[PDB]
Amino acid sequence: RGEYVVAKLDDLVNWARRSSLWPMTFGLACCAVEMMHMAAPRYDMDRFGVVFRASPRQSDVMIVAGTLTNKMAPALRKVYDQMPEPRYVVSMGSCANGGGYYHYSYSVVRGCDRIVPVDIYVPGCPPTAEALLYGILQLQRKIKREKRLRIWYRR
Amino acid sequence: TYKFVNMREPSMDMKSVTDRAAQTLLWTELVRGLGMTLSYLFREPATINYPFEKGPLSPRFRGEHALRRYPSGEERCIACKLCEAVCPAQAITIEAEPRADGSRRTTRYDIDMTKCIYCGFCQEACPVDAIVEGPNFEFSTETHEELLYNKEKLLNNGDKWEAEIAANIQADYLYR
Amino acid sequence: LHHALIPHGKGGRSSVSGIVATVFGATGFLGRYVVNHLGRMGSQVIVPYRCEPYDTMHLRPMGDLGQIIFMEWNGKDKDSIRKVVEHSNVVINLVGREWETKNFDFEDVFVKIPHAIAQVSKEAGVEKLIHISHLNADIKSPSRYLRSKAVGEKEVRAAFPEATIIKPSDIFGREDRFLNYFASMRWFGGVPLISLGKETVKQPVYIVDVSKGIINAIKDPDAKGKTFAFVGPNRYLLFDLVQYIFAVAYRPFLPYPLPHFAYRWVGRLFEVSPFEPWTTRDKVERVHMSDMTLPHLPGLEDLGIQATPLELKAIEVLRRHRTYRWLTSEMEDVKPAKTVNI
């Protein structure tokens, strides 16, 4: 039946997307250091299929790791625009989540969500590299639960 | 006491210069560089098998905030507002009101995880060990609003991680 | 008003406005824009959706955290509509489709679904329901889109007597399928106007104008029961309109008269596609109807919003279509297309 065929196509495409999540080298602050430590041998992003890649044209997930300030927010929004779809935003740290320590400052965006649609909120100051890996795996399951071709079949 | 890190003049004996020319032509330190990486590939990798294998922690680890309670069942919090008055990020909001029994307990105890800095200052300030930073750190959420913790959510965390948090405090209270 | 619906603040994101609303079909064109305005003033939006949640991602960052709430709903399920409209002051109906899918014809998305929305909204107890139709809505128009829209308007009026009915003429914007349609027609050789397109008069209205009109109608205490008609300020001849569209895009213009039945065949051929049907018979028809002037119906100016002429807001739409050659030319380089006087 057509539903089974589109189901299997959904599983294949979602598996590819979740098993080759290519992130972006967009570290901003101390939350980037853990972003490096999970790339360090101990946790090693590489075994999970995730390999760092600059040039947003060839990346899927943006881990906004660090404080997002007013002077940088236009750059972050523009760079998010460069990403071809599908795209995902993982927010690392309290600063990139809702403001963190400098939530009441004059030149800090009170949450990265106000600029891009954040897909996964990873809490911490900074989050432990295990916690960030957990957030990435949660995003992976999110991609696994996508129903693109199913919705197309029931257009 | 100081040392000259790069103050070495190379010897100009015929043997020395022959060795330098051999290293230049027949790449020698380059071969050493290859050999080092060969030696480490043959070595054991350091990666752990997350999530089936977890990196080591300590009983002092700071994670998800949680409200504890006495063994009787009554909450430890008495709304003294030390944690709210000491939080560097002003992430705690407390509203108190005398309960029906008479004990002073928070009618609202909200901790904003999206604004928290996980310093642990609240758990030091608490005179009754009511608010603690639990061992949990894998509590990422898909939406922002789920990170704005209420009193009920914090009490649920306290009731859930109580087995771990009681042991962690038991193994660390003597240092404090 | 309830104790939490009393307006508070200064109109910013974190301000209680009291416009708790449901926008059916928010995931597309004006459905996005309206939400933005609803998000801007600080109103709790109960945006329902049937598509993949990823497609609702651009819906997320226009409201303060906790304001926008997404729910799953199905057109042929009264329980879903009841769930989404149970706690809401206003229910805005923006459900539509330029084509007829296999599981949804024109009547389903313009009569049946609006009927269910209006009936369930009346049962729940909402105070305002803004239904959206087309200006050229007629029970005898050849295109099934406009005919279905007319019967849907009558049904919605019957079910919700005080429902505000807004009849926009033609929305042009960054994603409009009206200016981008003409611009994208460059791929298929020349632009094949029917009878050279010298008999059709179109009155396009800016998207921001329509969304602001919806917001004002919600805020206006007299929009209940009324039937507004949202049209642009000028009336363009279709050939002159395409001339302006291709001049602002600086693409070569190759007009080509085309017999009506041959264009119907072309529309069928494009309808065959099991994906986004670039052109349908309804589509090729509608671009040939003139915009029926309805002076009796109240307009945008009554709501207090001045229509923005297409010339000022045409560079936004067609700057993407320009090649690298005329990618930086200013807005005043191309002279406004001559307009037949209203």
Added chain:
Amino acid sequence: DTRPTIRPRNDVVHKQLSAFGQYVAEILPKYVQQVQVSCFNELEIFIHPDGVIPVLTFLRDHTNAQFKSLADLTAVDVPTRQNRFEIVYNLLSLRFNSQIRVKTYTDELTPIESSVTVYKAANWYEREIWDMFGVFFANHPDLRRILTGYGFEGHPFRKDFPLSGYVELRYDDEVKRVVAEPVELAQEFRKFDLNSPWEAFPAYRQPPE
């Protein structure tokens, strides 16, 4: 020791710093207004704002001073003073391993000669004082905002400036742009009035006026 908690006090350094303070006061009586050594052995020279270029140069070039490193250059804003802005120069002498402080005053609309000619490190520092406080430094190679965002309106570090500013940022889909809006916080900064109404230190007791 008899004082296991009280920080040890060095008096030889106090005598040396006092001697050098008198030395500098005698050398440049034109600008040196008042010199004082703190209890923790730090010497501060308060000069007239016209003595910014001369005095620094002396401290940079004299054989007995040899202060050849501008460690820090900052300003402190005290609204209750006439010339609220108070520019502070911190200098370090590597030959006599000694730190000196030269502090001058300036109001909102009075310029200060740029010390870029003397201390080329000041070039960026000056801009910061301009950006954070608004003190304009004349004869500067290039004065510009260094920390605030482009198009910022105001001087953040001024006391008469809210810590949350006046304008926040957002992304608007209608204009497809990162727009700026008037500030509106979800939770207002709870201003805590923590100050004991009992005098703390009898030593620093201001005489009544």
Added chain:
Amino acid sequence: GTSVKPIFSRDMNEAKRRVRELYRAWYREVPNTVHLFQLDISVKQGRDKVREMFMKNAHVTDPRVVDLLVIKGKMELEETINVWKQRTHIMRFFHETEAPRPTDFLSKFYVGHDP
């Protein structure tokens, strides 16, 4: 006491001269911003905004103040020239997303408790 140091100009006329040449630079610039920054507002729609910005602080009379805003406007021109400001930074001058605010007392009373 009543007499204090000058910034750049030594009278109001020289300050007006500096204001005049700053307006010269801005007026000459504006179309270059419209083209280079890919703005969609009309050229005149930016020149009149330059005029309005100049007319905003047209009430000041202390010379030193006038030199101060001359330097500040020079800095903003400097940012605009070498693409240091961006499209969003320039567009902030035209407050677009801001809803229009009312001026009559009656609407303010209807909308909220503010002066």
Added chain:
Amino acid sequence: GVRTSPTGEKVTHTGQAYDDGDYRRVRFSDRQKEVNENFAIDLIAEQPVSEVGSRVISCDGGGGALGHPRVYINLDKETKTGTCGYCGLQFRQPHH
């Protein structure tokens, strides 16, 4: 004990329940109202009142450093039982 409001919303220990004519309940549909079933108001009630045989008694909450600051309760009024202000445990003189 947690009970149900007429709308259907469970009331918390703080007596919080959104009104029927309140739009905020929209947040809870397709979700649940996170409440704590273990009510401290009830849980402290059935704890037995200790028959202390002295005029005053010291309570630390149990565990020394694990408990609350030690406070001394005066058990002199025969009409009431001395209750610690930190943990809520009651004490009573042996029938005086």
Added chain:
Amino acid sequence: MELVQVLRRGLQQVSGHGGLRGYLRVLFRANDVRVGTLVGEDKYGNKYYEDNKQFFGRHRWVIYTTEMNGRDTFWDVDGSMVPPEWHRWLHCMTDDPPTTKPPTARKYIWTNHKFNVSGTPQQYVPYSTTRKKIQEWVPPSTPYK
């Protein structure tokens, strides 16, 4: 000599994991084939192994349960599937497993360790936990006038 023993213990790898079928089960599920002493098991089904010979970090590990709380976890697993009592032992925060040293029991402690409830309709929605502050006048019902 060590080559032969090395080839041999690769067969103890398949023998320990209940034969070939269990060998591919653990290989495709937990991505490892290493064996270890069964330190314990929890009520949810996760099996908890330890091998002190492994270097610090992989001396203890979990094979997660196939099913927990009405959710198939045969293929998708996460770090929140660890019950609180065993999370201490797994993360090397103690050397006492719950089997030997069991955590103290109390009434308020849960009996079913819910995993991360994000995404599922059992999410957490923030809300005000306080009552109203200002009351209304509730005008009388008699027309009177």
